[PDB]
Design a protein around this ligand. Structure first.
Ligand SMILES: C[C@H](C[C@@H](C[C@H](C[C@@H](C[C@@H](CCN1CCCC1=O)N1CCCC1=O)N1CCCC1=O)N1CCCC1=O)N1CCCC1=O)N1CCCC1=O
Ligand SMILES: COc1cc(CCNC(=O)c2[nH]c(-c3c(F)cccc3F)nc(=O)c2O)ccc1O
Ligand SMILES: [Mn+2]
Ligand SMILES: [Mn+2]
Length: 179
């Protein structure tokens, strides 16, 4: 293995690691070699899960972390239930409270650059976008940040902790200059 891979395994809970492996293997990639993308997928997974963990019990439907086929099935059910237009690209969550799909982004650059890259791909303006950065910035469609400040602050804190641990192992630079 690699040092990034050992760190990923001691940084994220086993269940998130397993989901990141399945997600990568489903798209033909190997966590043992694509170790920077392994850490990113794990990170994006954890953020998605803390995000859904913010708010009420039945508020979100978690799309990320399922296999492509099942995720599109739930997405289909949500659209055929609420009437929301079917997104072109698989989103990360659905907000039953706001009746909109959510795309969660985690970036090592300026949240400004990432959101533009996502909003340009989505085009379907119905899908909400919420970007977090490893420096603690955030940016969301309509400045509607969906969750309370405390739930978002926990996500920002966790992201900076992952940044510090990677740097302590001299892995952060390679992780940053890889997105
Ligand atoms: C439903 C189930 C798994 C869920 C994943 C997600 C994990 C959640 C667990 C919570 C509780 N906490 C908090 C304390 C530690 C812990 O464990 N969090 C959030 C923080 C980290 C974490 O782990 N949730 C939410 C519902 C219960 C649950 O476990 N998933 C996986 C993808 C889709 C989905 O909804 N499924 C579904 C079938 C396969 C499987 O595993
Ligand atoms: C094609 O990309 C891949 C996607 C996956 C499963 C994750 N599914 C997503 O839809 C997704 N992916 C990413 C993302 C990325 F686009 C590049 C690098 C790291 C990432 F986390 N960010 C998101 O916010 C998001 O929702 C597995 C393997 C892939 O190669
Ligand atoms: Mn996704
Ligand atoms: Mn996402």
């Amino acid at each position: 293995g690699s040092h990034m891979e050992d760190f990923v395994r001691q940084c994220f809970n086993p269940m998130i690691v397993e989901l990141a492996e399945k997600a990568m293997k489903e798209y033909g990639e190997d966590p043992k070699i694509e170790t920077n993308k392994f850490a990113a997928t794990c990170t994006h997974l954890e953020v998605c899960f803390m995000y859904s963990d913010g708010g009420s019990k039945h508020r979100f439907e978690i799309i990320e972390g399922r296999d492509r086929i099942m995720a599109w099935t739930v997405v289909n059910s949500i659209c055929n239930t609420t009437g929301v237009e079917k997104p072109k690209f698989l989103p990360d969550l659905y907000d039953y409270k706001e009746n909109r799909f959510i795309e969660i982004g985690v970036t090592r650059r300026e949240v400004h650059i990432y959101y533009l890259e996502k909003a340009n791909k989505i085009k379907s303006e119905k899908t909400h976008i919420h970007i977090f950065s490893f420096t603690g910035e955030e940016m969301a469609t309509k400045a509607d940040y969906t969750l309370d400040e405390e739930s978002r602050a926990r996500i920002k804190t966790r992201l900076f902790t992952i940044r510090q641990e990677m740097a302590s192992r001299s892995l952060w630079d390679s992780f940053r200059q890889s997105e």
